[PDB]
């Protein structure tokens, strides 16, 4: 969690919006509903652009603020909406009025693409827009484990790929001898490969994959997979999809 810096970055941005867009955060009436001291997502993005390269970048910045609590949706939704009908508030107490803004924009922009990729991934398979599938596809272009596959194939994987986050190191993902149900790509983190006979046989890092032996050979898992770091993030492909798309 880099939550503390996002917050102060958000706090820093929040100060320059009130100064540059004095009527961005106001009372609003939508469908005869009244929302106090809020802004629309679409106008929030607009205002961030007005400060002074792309809209998708700014959308990523907003997603990052929503994620770290530096921005909160009126209707408690987790995907940021670049829309007129969606309203957001800054939280925390009012900050003091107004290079620090520059580095606050950079820190937020650095995390934007991942924030937007996570939203696409958190969308269950079959409920992904072409734009979300577009984001997941471009990510597979950066994964060593699938580089030898065709774009058509990567596209198929994007359609069925499953997002599987974890938090604690030392978690046993599956054990030697278990029925093999799924293929795994390491988006973030690393894992230990442990066999009963030799102990730690190897370490896999971001961009590697594991768990195909059990699917390809119709056999029990040949090793225990243990999370080596905090916050491992996996892309998972279930057996049926793996077999249909990789056999
Ligand atoms: N030396 C190794 N022995 C066995 N499995 C390994 C080894 N190195 C990496 N692996 C991976 O560990 C996985 C454990 O489950 P699988 O047998 O399905 O697929 C295996 C491989 O992807």
TrEMBL record:
All residue ranges annotated as the DEP domain in the record: 25-92
Q: Which residues form the Cyclic nucleotide-binding domain?
A: 145-246
Q: What is the protein named?
A: cDNA FLJ56134, highly similar to Rap guanine nucleotide exchange factor 3
Organism for this UniProt entry: Homo sapiens (Human)
Query: What does the organism's lineage look like at the top?
Result: Eukaryota, Metazoa, Chordata, Craniata, Vertebrata
């Amino acid at each position: 969690a880099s939550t503390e810096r996002v917050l102060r970055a958000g706090r820093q941005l929040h100060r320059h919006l009130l100064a540059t867009c004095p009527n961005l955060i106001r009372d609003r009436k939508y469908h005869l509903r009244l929302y106090r001291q809020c802004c629309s997502g679409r106008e929030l993005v607009d205002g961030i652009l007005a400060l002074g390269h792309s809209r998708s970048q700014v959308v990523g910045i907003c997603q990052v603020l929503l994620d770290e609590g530096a921005l909160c949706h009126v209707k408690h939704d987790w995907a940021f909406q670049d829309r007129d009908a969606q309203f957001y508030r800054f939280p925390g107490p009012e900050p003091e009025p107004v290079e620090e803004l520059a580095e606050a924009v950079a820190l937020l922009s650095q995390r934007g693409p991942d924030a937007l990729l996570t939203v696409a991934l958190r969308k269950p398979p079959g409920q992904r827009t072409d734009e979300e599938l577009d984001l997941i596809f471009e990510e597979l272009l950066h994964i060593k484990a699938v580089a030898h596959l065709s774009n058509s194939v990567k596209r198929e994987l994007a359609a069925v790929l499953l997002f599987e986050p974890h938090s604690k190191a030392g978690t046993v993902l599956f054990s030697q001898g278990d029925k093999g149900t799924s293929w795994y790509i390491i988006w973030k983190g690393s894992v230990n490969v442990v066999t009963h006979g030799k102990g730690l046989v190897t370490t896999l890092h971001e961009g590697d994959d594991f768990g195909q032996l059990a699917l390809v050979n119709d056999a029990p898992r040949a090793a225990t997979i243990i999370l080596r770091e905090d916050n491992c993030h996996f892309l998972r492909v279930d057996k049926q999809d793996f077999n249909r798309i990789i056999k």
